[PDB]
Amino acid sequence: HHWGYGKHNGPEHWHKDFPIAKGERQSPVDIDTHTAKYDPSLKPLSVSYDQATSLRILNNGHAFNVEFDDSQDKAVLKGGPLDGTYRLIQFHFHWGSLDGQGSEHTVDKKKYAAELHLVHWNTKYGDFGKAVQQPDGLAVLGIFLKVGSAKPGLQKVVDVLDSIKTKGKSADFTNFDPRGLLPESLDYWTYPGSLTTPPLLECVTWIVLKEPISVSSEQVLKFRKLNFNGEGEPEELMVDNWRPAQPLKNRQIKASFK
Amino acid sequence: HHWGYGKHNGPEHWHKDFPIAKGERQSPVDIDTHTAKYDPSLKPLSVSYDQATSLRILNNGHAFNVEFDDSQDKAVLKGGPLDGTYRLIQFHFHWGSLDGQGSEHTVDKKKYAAELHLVHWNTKYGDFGKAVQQPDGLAVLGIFLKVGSAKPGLQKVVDVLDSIKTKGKSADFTNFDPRGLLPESLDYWTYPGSLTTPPLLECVTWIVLKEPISVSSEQVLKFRKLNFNGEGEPEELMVDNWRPAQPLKNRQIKASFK
Ligand SMILES: [Zn+2]
Ligand SMILES: [Zn+2]
Ligand SMILES: [Zn+2]
Ligand SMILES: [Zn+2]
Ligand SMILES: [Zn+2]
Ligand SMILES: [Zn+2]
Ligand SMILES: [Zn+2]
Numbered sequence A, B: 001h002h003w004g005y006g007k008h009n010g011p012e013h014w015h016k017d018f019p020i021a022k023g024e025r026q027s028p029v030d031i032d033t034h035t036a037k038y039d040p041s042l043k044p045l046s047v048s049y050d051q052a053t054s055l056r057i058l059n060n061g062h063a064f065n066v067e068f069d070d071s072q073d074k075a076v077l078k079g080g081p082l083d084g085t086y087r088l089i090q091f092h093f094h095w096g097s098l099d100g101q102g103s104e105h106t107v108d109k110k111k112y113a114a115e116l117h118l119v120h121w122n123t124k125y126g127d128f129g130k131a132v133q134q135p136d137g138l139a140v141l142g143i144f145l146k147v148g149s150a151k152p153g154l155q156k157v158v159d160v161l162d163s164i165k166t167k168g169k170s171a172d173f174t175n176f177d178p179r180g181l182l183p184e185s186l187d188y189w190t191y192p193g194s195l196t197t198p199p200l201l202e203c204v205t206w207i208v209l210k211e212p213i214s215v216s217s218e219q220v221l222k223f224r225k226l227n228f229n230g231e232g233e234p235e236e237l238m239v240d241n242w243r244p245a246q247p248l249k250n251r252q253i254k255a256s257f258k
Protein backbone atom coordinates (compact mmCIF):
# COMPACT_ATOMS: atom_id res chain seq x y z
CA HIS A 1 0.00 0.00 0.00
CA HIS A 2 2.51 2.60 1.21
CA TRP A 3 5.79 3.08 3.04
CA GLY A 4 7.01 0.62 5.64
CA TYR A 5 10.04 -1.40 6.65
CA GLY A 6 10.00 -4.26 4.09
CA LYS A 7 12.22 -5.30 1.12
CA HIS A 8 10.41 -2.97 -1.34
CA ASN A 9 8.85 -0.20 0.84
CA GLY A 10 11.67 0.12 3.39
CA PRO A 11 13.92 3.13 4.41
CA GLU A 12 16.17 2.73 1.34
CA HIS A 13 13.13 3.52 -0.89
CA TRP A 14 11.42 6.29 1.18
CA HIS A 15 13.27 9.00 -0.79
CA LYS A 16 11.10 8.16 -3.84
CA ASP A 17 7.86 9.44 -2.31
CA PHE A 18 9.59 11.56 0.38
CA PRO A 19 12.50 13.58 -1.12
CA ILE A 20 13.23 15.24 2.29
CA ALA A 21 14.62 11.77 3.21
CA LYS A 22 17.88 13.09 1.66
CA GLY A 23 17.60 16.45 3.48
CA GLU A 24 20.06 18.31 5.72
CA ARG A 25 18.55 17.55 9.15
CA GLN A 26 17.46 13.92 8.88
CA SER A 27 17.21 11.51 11.75
CA PRO A 28 18.33 9.27 13.22
CA VAL A 29 22.14 9.63 13.34
CA ASP A 30 25.12 7.89 14.82
CA ILE A 31 26.15 9.60 18.00
CA ASP A 32 29.95 9.64 17.98
CA THR A 33 31.07 10.23 21.59
CA HIS A 34 34.50 11.50 20.47
CA THR A 35 32.94 14.36 18.42
CA ALA A 36 29.71 14.88 20.41
CA LYS A 37 31.29 17.39 22.78
CA TYR A 38 30.24 18.32 26.30
CA ASP A 39 28.56 21.72 26.18
CA PRO A 40 28.54 23.18 29.74
CA SER A 41 25.81 25.76 28.79
CA LEU A 42 23.19 22.99 28.36
CA LYS A 43 20.58 23.15 31.16
CA PRO A 44 19.46 20.00 32.97
CA LEU A 45 16.40 18.34 31.49
CA SER A 46 13.10 18.68 33.39
CA VAL A 47 10.68 15.79 32.84
CA SER A 48 7.25 16.25 34.48
CA TYR A 49 5.25 13.12 33.88
CA ASP A 50 3.60 12.75 37.35
CA GLN A 51 0.23 13.90 36.05
CA ALA A 52 0.40 12.11 32.70
CA THR A 53 -3.05 10.98 31.48
CA SER A 54 -2.71 8.03 29.05
CA LEU A 55 -5.76 7.40 26.85
CA ARG A 56 -5.24 4.51 24.45
CA ILE A 57 -2.83 2.17 22.71
CA LEU A 58 -2.92 1.44 18.98
CA ASN A 59 -1.26 -0.47 16.17
CA ASN A 60 -0.92 1.89 13.20
CA GLY A 61 0.86 -0.66 10.95
CA HIS A 62 4.29 0.86 11.71
CA ALA A 63 4.65 0.63 15.48
CA PHE A 64 2.28 0.84 18.45
CA ASN A 65 1.49 4.23 19.99
CA VAL A 66 0.36 5.02 23.50
CA GLU A 67 -1.49 8.31 23.24
CA PHE A 68 -1.95 10.95 25.94
CA ASP A 69 -4.34 13.73 26.92
CA ASP A 70 -2.37 16.79 25.68
CA SER A 71 -5.14 19.38 26.13
CA GLN A 72 -3.24 20.84 29.17
CA ASP A 73 0.32 21.14 30.62
CA LYS A 74 0.03 17.78 32.52
CA ALA A 75 2.90 15.76 31.12
CA VAL A 76 5.60 18.04 29.81
CA LEU A 77 9.18 18.39 28.90
CA LYS A 78 11.11 21.57 29.70
CA GLY A 79 14.66 22.81 30.11
CA GLY A 80 17.68 21.10 28.60
CA PRO A 81 18.08 22.59 25.13
CA LEU A 82 14.37 23.56 24.97
CA ASP A 83 12.85 27.02 25.02
CA GLY A 84 9.47 26.94 26.74
CA THR A 85 7.10 24.03 27.23
CA TYR A 86 6.56 20.86 25.21
CA ARG A 87 3.59 18.56 25.84
CA LEU A 88 3.67 14.79 25.69
CA ILE A 89 1.31 13.48 23.00
CA GLN A 90 2.43 9.89 22.54
CA PHE A 91 5.20 7.38 22.99
CA HIS A 92 6.19 4.44 20.84
CA PHE A 93 9.12 2.09 20.21
CA HIS A 94 11.29 0.87 17.41
CA TRP A 95 12.76 -2.63 17.75
CA GLY A 96 14.64 -5.37 15.96
CA SER A 97 14.13 -9.03 15.00
CA LEU A 98 17.25 -9.85 17.01
CA ASP A 99 18.64 -8.36 20.24
CA GLY A 100 21.66 -6.94 18.35
CA GLN A 101 19.63 -4.40 16.39
CA GLY A 102 16.51 -2.28 16.68
CA SER A 103 17.43 1.20 17.82
CA GLU A 104 17.36 4.14 15.43
CA HIS A 105 20.08 6.23 16.99
CA THR A 106 23.37 4.48 17.54
CA VAL A 107 26.23 5.33 19.94
CA ASP A 108 29.68 4.84 18.38
CA LYS A 109 27.90 2.67 15.84
CA LYS A 110 26.53 0.42 18.62
CA LYS A 111 22.89 -0.53 18.05
CA TYR A 112 20.54 -1.26 20.92
CA ALA A 113 17.71 -3.87 20.91
CA ALA A 114 15.01 -1.14 20.84
CA GLU A 115 14.46 2.61 21.21
CA LEU A 116 11.62 4.40 23.02
CA HIS A 117 10.47 7.72 21.60
CA LEU A 118 8.46 10.07 23.81
CA VAL A 119 6.96 12.68 21.46
CA HIS A 120 6.27 16.21 22.63
CA TRP A 121 5.08 19.35 20.85
CA ASN A 122 5.85 22.97 21.49
CA THR A 123 2.92 24.78 23.31
CA LYS A 124 3.96 28.09 21.63
CA TYR A 125 2.17 26.79 18.46
CA GLY A 126 -1.23 25.85 19.94
CA ASP A 127 -1.48 22.30 18.59
CA PHE A 128 0.61 19.40 17.28
CA GLY A 129 -0.57 20.04 13.69
CA LYS A 130 0.85 23.55 13.68
CA ALA A 131 3.90 22.52 15.76
CA VAL A 132 5.16 19.92 13.19
CA GLN A 133 5.39 22.70 10.54
CA GLN A 134 8.13 24.44 12.59
CA PRO A 135 11.85 23.62 13.03
CA ASP A 136 11.38 23.85 16.83
CA GLY A 137 7.93 22.23 16.83
CA LEU A 138 8.68 18.89 18.44
CA ALA A 139 10.94 17.46 21.04
CA VAL A 140 11.42 13.71 21.02
CA LEU A 141 13.02 12.10 24.05
CA GLY A 142 14.86 9.03 22.88
CA ILE A 143 15.65 6.22 25.26
CA PHE A 144 17.65 3.10 24.41
CA LEU A 145 16.44 -0.36 25.44
CA LYS A 146 18.95 -3.09 26.32
CA VAL A 147 18.17 -6.73 27.11
CA GLY A 148 18.55 -7.54 30.80
CA SER A 149 16.24 -7.35 33.81
CA ALA A 150 12.50 -6.80 33.18
CA LYS A 151 11.36 -3.17 33.22
CA PRO A 152 8.52 -3.11 35.81
CA GLY A 153 7.07 0.08 34.29
CA LEU A 154 7.02 -1.49 30.79
CA GLN A 155 4.95 -4.50 31.94
CA LYS A 156 1.52 -2.84 31.69
CA VAL A 157 2.27 -2.02 27.99
CA VAL A 158 3.53 -5.52 27.19
CA ASP A 159 0.43 -7.07 28.87
CA VAL A 160 -2.01 -5.39 26.47
CA LEU A 161 -0.14 -6.12 23.17
CA ASP A 162 -2.05 -9.35 22.37
CA SER A 163 -5.20 -7.16 22.03
CA ILE A 164 -3.50 -4.90 19.35
CA LYS A 165 -1.67 -7.55 17.34
CA THR A 166 -2.69 -6.25 13.92
CA LYS A 167 -2.82 -2.92 12.09
CA GLY A 168 -5.77 -0.74 13.04
CA LYS A 169 -6.39 -2.41 16.40
CA SER A 170 -6.67 -0.19 19.44
CA ALA A 171 -7.48 -0.58 23.11
CA ASP A 172 -8.25 1.63 26.11
CA PHE A 173 -5.04 2.30 28.03
CA THR A 174 -5.69 4.61 30.97
CA ASN A 175 -3.66 5.29 34.14
CA PHE A 176 -0.30 4.43 32.56
CA ASP A 177 2.60 6.27 34.21
CA PRO A 178 5.41 6.98 31.66
CA ARG A 179 7.92 7.81 34.49
CA GLY A 180 8.30 4.06 34.85
CA LEU A 181 9.97 4.03 31.38
CA LEU A 182 12.85 6.33 32.32
CA PRO A 183 16.37 5.56 33.46
CA GLU A 184 17.87 7.11 36.56
CA SER A 185 20.16 9.58 34.76
CA LEU A 186 18.79 12.25 32.44
CA ASP A 187 22.20 12.94 30.90
CA TYR A 188 21.55 13.43 27.20
CA TRP A 189 22.82 14.29 23.78
CA THR A 190 20.93 16.74 21.60
CA TYR A 191 20.89 17.80 17.95
CA PRO A 192 18.41 19.29 15.45
CA GLY A 193 16.75 16.63 13.35
CA SER A 194 13.65 15.09 11.87
CA LEU A 195 10.88 12.57 12.30
CA THR A 196 12.40 9.11 11.61
CA THR A 197 9.28 8.02 9.69
CA PRO A 198 7.50 9.59 6.72
CA PRO A 199 6.72 12.42 6.25
CA LEU A 200 10.27 12.85 7.67
CA LEU A 201 9.65 16.52 8.59
CA GLU A 202 12.65 18.47 9.91
CA CYS A 203 10.90 19.70 13.08
CA VAL A 204 12.51 17.80 15.92
CA THR A 205 14.90 18.73 18.64
CA TRP A 206 16.25 15.30 19.50
CA ILE A 207 17.14 14.59 23.08
CA VAL A 208 18.67 11.13 23.43
CA LEU A 209 19.41 9.76 26.87
CA LYS A 210 22.86 8.39 27.61
CA GLU A 211 21.53 5.71 29.96
CA PRO A 212 19.52 2.90 28.44
CA ILE A 213 16.72 1.16 30.23
CA SER A 214 16.85 -2.55 30.82
CA VAL A 215 14.08 -4.78 29.48
CA SER A 216 13.72 -8.58 29.60
CA SER A 217 14.09 -10.92 26.62
CA GLU A 218 10.38 -11.75 27.18
CA GLN A 219 9.22 -8.10 27.06
CA VAL A 220 10.97 -7.51 23.70
CA LEU A 221 9.71 -10.92 22.39
CA LYS A 222 6.13 -9.73 22.96
CA PHE A 223 6.97 -6.65 20.72
CA ARG A 224 8.15 -9.03 17.97
CA LYS A 225 4.78 -10.87 18.08
CA LEU A 226 3.00 -7.79 16.68
CA ASN A 227 1.99 -7.67 12.99
CA PHE A 228 2.59 -4.95 10.37
CA ASN A 229 -0.48 -6.28 8.55
CA GLY A 230 -4.20 -6.03 9.32
CA GLU A 231 -6.30 -8.95 10.60
CA GLY A 232 -6.81 -11.44 7.72
CA GLU A 233 -4.03 -10.12 5.46
CA PRO A 234 -0.89 -12.29 5.17
CA GLU A 235 1.19 -12.36 8.36
CA GLU A 236 4.13 -9.97 8.32
CA LEU A 237 5.76 -9.74 11.80
CA MET A 238 6.33 -6.21 13.17
CA VAL A 239 10.10 -6.35 13.54
CA ASP A 240 12.99 -4.21 12.39
CA ASN A 241 10.82 -1.08 12.29
CA TRP A 242 13.83 1.23 12.60
CA ARG A 243 15.41 3.64 10.14
CA PRO A 244 19.18 3.35 9.97
CA ALA A 245 21.56 6.20 10.79
CA GLN A 246 21.59 9.08 8.34
CA PRO A 247 24.43 11.58 7.50
CA LEU A 248 25.11 14.16 10.17
CA LYS A 249 26.04 16.78 7.51
CA ASN A 250 26.56 20.34 8.87
CA ARG A 251 25.19 19.55 12.35
CA GLN A 252 26.71 19.39 15.79
CA ILE A 253 25.58 16.91 18.47
CA LYS A 254 25.95 18.40 21.96
CA ALA A 255 26.34 16.44 25.21
CA SER A 256 24.88 17.59 28.55
CA PHE A 257 27.63 15.70 30.39
CA LYS A 258 31.44 15.33 30.47
CA HIS B 1 -9.91 19.21 12.96
CA HIS B 2 -10.80 18.11 9.36
CA TRP B 3 -13.76 17.51 6.98
CA GLY B 4 -17.00 16.17 8.40
CA TYR B 5 -20.74 16.77 8.44
CA GLY B 6 -21.00 19.68 10.93
CA LYS B 7 -21.92 23.39 10.68
CA HIS B 8 -18.39 24.49 9.69
CA ASN B 9 -16.76 21.36 8.13
CA GLY B 10 -19.83 19.99 6.32
CA PRO B 11 -20.56 19.30 2.60
CA GLU B 12 -21.19 23.02 1.85
CA HIS B 13 -17.55 23.77 2.79
CA TRP B 14 -15.75 20.70 1.28
CA HIS B 15 -15.04 22.65 -1.96
CA LYS B 16 -12.50 24.79 -0.01
CA ASP B 17 -10.03 21.94 0.58
CA PHE B 18 -11.48 19.72 -2.21
CA PRO B 19 -12.06 21.73 -5.43
CA ILE B 20 -13.29 18.58 -7.28
CA ALA B 21 -16.43 18.98 -5.07
CA LYS B 22 -17.62 21.38 -7.86
CA GLY B 23 -16.55 18.91 -10.60
CA GLU B 24 -18.50 17.44 -13.54
CA ARG B 25 -19.17 13.95 -12.21
CA GLN B 26 -20.01 14.49 -8.54
CA SER B 27 -22.19 12.22 -6.45
CA PRO B 28 -24.77 11.80 -5.16
CA VAL B 29 -27.57 13.04 -7.44
CA ASP B 30 -31.32 13.17 -7.55
CA ILE B 31 -32.64 10.35 -9.68
CA ASP B 32 -35.45 11.84 -11.68
CA THR B 33 -37.60 8.89 -12.93
CA HIS B 34 -39.09 11.00 -15.74
CA THR B 35 -35.65 11.59 -17.31
CA ALA B 36 -33.80 8.47 -16.10
CA LYS B 37 -34.81 6.45 -19.17
CA TYR B 38 -35.06 2.67 -19.56
CA ASP B 39 -32.06 1.52 -21.57
CA PRO B 40 -32.80 -1.98 -23.01
CA SER B 41 -29.06 -2.60 -23.75
CA LEU B 42 -28.23 -2.70 -20.00
CA LYS B 43 -27.30 -6.27 -19.00
CA PRO B 44 -28.73 -7.78 -15.76
CA LEU B 45 -26.62 -7.26 -12.69
CA SER B 46 -24.70 -10.27 -11.35
CA VAL B 47 -24.07 -10.13 -7.60
CA SER B 48 -21.92 -12.97 -6.36
CA TYR B 49 -21.63 -12.63 -2.59
CA ASP B 50 -22.01 -16.35 -1.63
CA GLN B 51 -18.27 -16.66 -0.81
CA ALA B 52 -17.92 -13.19 0.85
CA THR B 53 -15.32 -13.13 3.62
CA SER B 54 -15.99 -10.25 6.03
CA LEU B 55 -13.03 -9.26 8.26
CA ARG B 56 -13.83 -6.34 10.54
CA ILE B 57 -16.05 -3.41 11.38
CA LEU B 58 -14.76 0.07 12.21
CA ASN B 59 -15.76 3.63 13.09
CA ASN B 60 -13.60 5.97 11.05
CA GLY B 61 -15.21 9.20 12.43
CA HIS B 62 -17.41 9.53 9.32
CA ALA B 63 -19.40 6.32 9.13
CA PHE B 64 -18.79 2.69 10.07
CA ASN B 65 -17.22 0.32 7.52
CA VAL B 66 -17.43 -3.47 7.27
CA GLU B 67 -14.33 -4.57 5.42
CA PHE B 68 -13.84 -7.69 3.28
CA ASP B 69 -11.08 -10.00 2.10
CA ASP B 70 -10.62 -8.76 -1.49
CA SER B 71 -7.49 -10.84 -2.31
CA GLN B 72 -9.52 -13.09 -4.65
CA ASP B 73 -12.64 -13.06 -6.87
CA LYS B 74 -14.89 -14.34 -4.05
CA ALA B 75 -17.41 -11.51 -3.56
CA VAL B 76 -17.77 -9.76 -6.87
CA LEU B 77 -19.98 -7.59 -8.93
CA LYS B 78 -20.25 -8.15 -12.68
CA GLY B 79 -22.53 -7.45 -15.57
CA GLY B 80 -25.04 -4.63 -15.56
CA PRO B 81 -23.16 -1.58 -16.91
CA LEU B 82 -19.78 -3.01 -15.84
CA ASP B 83 -16.96 -4.24 -18.03
CA GLY B 84 -15.14 -7.05 -16.27
CA THR B 85 -14.95 -7.92 -12.62
CA TYR B 86 -15.23 -5.69 -9.54
CA ARG B 87 -14.34 -6.98 -6.06
CA LEU B 88 -16.20 -6.12 -2.88
CA ILE B 89 -13.85 -4.31 -0.44
CA GLN B 90 -16.25 -2.76 2.09
CA PHE B 91 -19.77 -1.64 2.85
CA HIS B 92 -21.05 1.28 4.92
CA PHE B 93 -24.16 3.42 5.46
CA HIS B 94 -25.25 6.99 5.50
CA TRP B 95 -28.18 7.93 7.69
CA GLY B 96 -30.17 10.81 9.13
CA SER B 97 -31.16 12.21 12.53
CA LEU B 98 -34.81 11.74 11.54
CA ASP B 99 -36.50 9.01 9.44
CA GLY B 100 -37.33 11.58 6.71
CA GLN B 101 -33.71 12.12 5.71
CA GLY B 102 -30.41 10.26 5.52
CA SER B 103 -29.95 8.87 2.01
CA GLU B 104 -27.43 10.43 -0.38
CA HIS B 105 -29.18 9.61 -3.61
CA THR B 106 -32.78 10.71 -3.84
CA VAL B 107 -35.56 9.46 -6.14
CA ASP B 108 -37.80 12.28 -7.48
CA LYS B 109 -36.40 14.31 -4.60
CA LYS B 110 -37.64 11.69 -2.07
CA LYS B 111 -35.07 11.06 0.66
CA TYR B 112 -34.83 7.71 2.41
CA ALA B 113 -33.91 7.17 6.08
CA ALA B 114 -30.54 5.66 5.16
CA GLU B 115 -28.44 4.37 2.24
CA LEU B 116 -26.19 1.34 2.09
CA HIS B 117 -23.08 1.51 -0.11
CA LEU B 118 -21.32 -1.70 -1.19
CA VAL B 119 -17.93 -0.64 -2.56
CA HIS B 120 -16.17 -2.61 -5.32
CA TRP B 121 -12.97 -2.01 -7.27
CA ASN B 122 -12.07 -2.97 -10.79
CA THR B 123 -9.74 -6.06 -10.93
CA LYS B 124 -8.23 -4.73 -14.20
CA TYR B 125 -6.13 -2.33 -12.05
CA GLY B 126 -4.67 -4.87 -9.57
CA ASP B 127 -5.58 -3.10 -6.34
CA PHE B 128 -7.99 -0.55 -4.87
CA GLY B 129 -5.24 2.09 -4.63
CA LYS B 130 -4.60 2.00 -8.37
CA ALA B 131 -8.33 1.53 -9.16
CA VAL B 132 -9.45 4.83 -7.45
CA GLN B 133 -7.17 6.79 -9.82
CA GLN B 134 -9.31 5.67 -12.82
CA PRO B 135 -12.75 6.87 -14.01
CA ASP B 136 -13.91 3.21 -14.15
CA GLY B 137 -12.01 2.16 -11.00
CA LEU B 138 -14.89 1.61 -8.57
CA ALA B 139 -18.45 0.36 -8.66
CA VAL B 140 -20.65 1.29 -5.71
CA LEU B 141 -23.94 -0.57 -5.27
CA GLY B 142 -26.35 1.81 -3.53
CA ILE B 143 -29.33 0.46 -1.64
CA PHE B 144 -32.01 2.61 0.02
CA LEU B 145 -33.20 1.89 3.58
CA LYS B 146 -36.81 2.58 4.52
CA VAL B 147 -38.32 2.31 7.99
CA GLY B 148 -40.56 -0.71 8.34
CA SER B 149 -40.01 -4.34 9.29
CA ALA B 150 -36.63 -5.31 10.78
CA LYS B 151 -34.01 -6.52 8.30
CA PRO B 152 -32.88 -9.92 9.68
CA GLY B 153 -29.57 -9.74 7.75
CA LEU B 154 -28.84 -6.26 9.20
CA GLN B 155 -29.21 -7.48 12.80
CA LYS B 156 -25.67 -8.88 13.11
CA VAL B 157 -24.25 -5.43 12.16
CA VAL B 158 -26.56 -3.52 14.54
CA ASP B 159 -25.62 -5.93 17.38
CA VAL B 160 -21.93 -5.03 17.27
CA LEU B 161 -22.32 -1.20 17.07
CA ASP B 162 -22.06 -0.59 20.86
CA SER B 163 -18.44 -1.89 20.63
CA ILE B 164 -17.54 0.74 17.92
CA LYS B 165 -19.39 3.74 19.34
CA THR B 166 -16.52 6.21 18.89
CA LYS B 167 -13.99 7.20 16.21
CA GLY B 168 -11.10 4.78 15.77
CA LYS B 169 -12.86 1.82 17.39
CA SER B 170 -12.90 -1.47 15.53
CA ALA B 171 -14.03 -5.01 16.13
CA ASP B 172 -13.62 -8.43 14.51
CA PHE B 173 -16.56 -9.11 12.21
CA THR B 174 -16.14 -12.44 10.43
CA ASN B 175 -18.66 -14.71 8.70
CA PHE B 176 -21.04 -11.89 7.79
CA ASP B 177 -23.07 -12.66 4.65
CA PRO B 178 -23.82 -9.41 2.72
CA ARG B 179 -26.54 -11.18 0.63
CA GLY B 180 -28.76 -10.58 3.69
CA LEU B 181 -28.60 -6.81 2.93
CA LEU B 182 -30.09 -7.07 -0.58
CA PRO B 183 -33.65 -6.61 -1.76
CA GLU B 184 -35.40 -9.17 -3.99
CA SER B 185 -35.15 -7.15 -7.20
CA LEU B 186 -31.82 -6.06 -8.67
CA ASP B 187 -33.46 -3.47 -10.92
CA TYR B 188 -31.15 -0.46 -10.91
CA TRP B 189 -30.25 2.95 -12.16
CA THR B 190 -26.71 3.75 -13.20
CA TYR B 191 -24.58 6.82 -13.95
CA PRO B 192 -20.88 7.85 -13.84
CA GLY B 193 -20.02 9.64 -10.60
CA SER B 194 -17.77 10.12 -7.63
CA LEU B 195 -17.07 9.24 -4.07
CA THR B 196 -19.62 11.08 -1.87
CA THR B 197 -16.94 11.85 0.74
CA PRO B 198 -13.56 13.57 0.43
CA PRO B 199 -11.37 13.18 -1.53
CA LEU B 200 -14.47 13.12 -3.83
CA LEU B 201 -12.60 11.36 -6.65
CA GLU B 202 -14.50 10.88 -9.92
CA CYS B 203 -13.91 7.15 -10.19
CA VAL B 204 -17.27 5.53 -9.53
CA THR B 205 -19.81 3.80 -11.68
CA TRP B 206 -22.93 4.15 -9.49
CA ILE B 207 -25.46 1.38 -9.48
CA VAL B 208 -28.45 2.29 -7.31
CA LEU B 209 -31.16 -0.32 -6.64
CA LYS B 210 -34.80 0.61 -7.28
CA GLU B 211 -36.10 -1.55 -4.42
CA PRO B 212 -35.23 -0.33 -0.93
CA ILE B 213 -34.68 -2.68 1.93
CA SER B 214 -36.86 -2.40 5.00
CA VAL B 215 -35.25 -1.76 8.40
CA SER B 216 -36.88 -1.25 11.80
CA SER B 217 -37.05 2.05 13.71
CA GLU B 218 -34.90 0.27 16.34
CA GLN B 219 -32.15 -0.77 13.89
CA VAL B 220 -31.75 2.82 12.59
CA LEU B 221 -31.90 4.19 16.18
CA LYS B 222 -28.80 2.08 17.01
CA PHE B 223 -27.02 3.81 14.03
CA ARG B 224 -27.88 7.22 15.51
CA LYS B 225 -26.23 6.21 18.86
CA LEU B 226 -22.79 6.20 17.19
CA ASN B 227 -20.38 9.10 17.73
CA PHE B 228 -18.40 11.19 15.19
CA ASN B 229 -15.93 11.91 18.02
CA GLY B 230 -13.29 9.74 19.72
CA GLU B 231 -13.69 8.25 23.27
CA GLY B 232 -13.32 11.09 25.85
CA GLU B 233 -13.74 13.94 23.35
CA PRO B 234 -17.05 15.91 23.59
CA GLU B 235 -20.05 13.91 22.32
CA GLU B 236 -21.16 14.59 18.73
CA LEU B 237 -23.74 12.02 17.59
CA MET B 238 -23.05 10.33 14.24
CA VAL B 239 -26.18 11.48 12.44
CA ASP B 240 -26.84 13.19 9.15
CA ASN B 241 -23.61 11.86 7.62
CA TRP B 242 -24.92 12.27 4.06
CA ARG B 243 -23.92 14.58 1.25
CA PRO B 244 -26.90 16.20 -0.42
CA ALA B 245 -27.71 15.75 -4.10
CA GLN B 246 -25.29 17.43 -6.51
CA PRO B 247 -26.00 18.76 -10.01
CA LEU B 248 -26.33 16.11 -12.70
CA LYS B 249 -24.66 18.40 -15.30
CA ASN B 250 -23.89 16.71 -18.68
CA ARG B 251 -24.64 13.16 -17.46
CA GLN B 252 -27.35 10.64 -18.26
CA ILE B 253 -28.84 8.30 -15.63
CA LYS B 254 -29.89 4.99 -17.22
CA ALA B 255 -32.52 2.56 -15.87
CA SER B 256 -32.22 -1.23 -16.20
CA PHE B 257 -36.03 -1.52 -16.07
CA LYS B 258 -39.16 -0.13 -17.81
ZN1 LIG C 1 15.33 5.88 -6.05
ZN1 LIG D 1 34.69 8.33 16.22
ZN1 LIG E 1 38.55 9.65 19.22
ZN1 LIG F 1 37.24 10.16 16.17
ZN1 LIG G 1 0.91 4.05 7.43
ZN1 LIG H 1 -4.77 16.87 21.64
ZN1 LIG I 1 10.02 6.97 16.65
Ligand SMILES: [Zn+2]
Binding pocket: A172, B231
Ligand atom coordinates in the same frame (compact mmCIF):
# COMPACT_ATOMS: atom_id res chain seq x y z
ZN1 LIG J 1 -13.81 2.11 26.07
Ligand SMILES: [Zn+2]
Binding pocket: A006, A236
Ligand atom coordinates in the same frame (compact mmCIF):
# COMPACT_ATOMS: atom_id res chain seq x y z
ZN1 LIG K 1 3.92 -6.98 2.94
Ligand SMILES: [Zn+2]
Binding pocket: B015, B016
Ligand atom coordinates in the same frame (compact mmCIF):
# COMPACT_ATOMS: atom_id res chain seq x y z
ZN1 LIG L 1 -16.12 28.88 -0.75
Ligand SMILES: [Zn+2]
Binding pocket: B002, B060, B061, B062
Ligand atom coordinates in the same frame (compact mmCIF):
# COMPACT_ATOMS: atom_id res chain seq x y z
ZN1 LIG M 1 -11.40 11.41 8.47
Ligand SMILES: [Zn+2]
Binding pocket: B068, B069, B070, B071
Ligand atom coordinates in the same frame (compact mmCIF):
# COMPACT_ATOMS: atom_id res chain seq x y z
ZN1 LIG N 1 -7.56 -6.01 0.77
Ligand SMILES: [Zn+2]
Binding pocket: B092, B093, B094, B117, B196
Ligand atom coordinates in the same frame (compact mmCIF):
# COMPACT_ATOMS: atom_id res chain seq x y z
ZN1 LIG O 1 -21.01 6.02 1.00
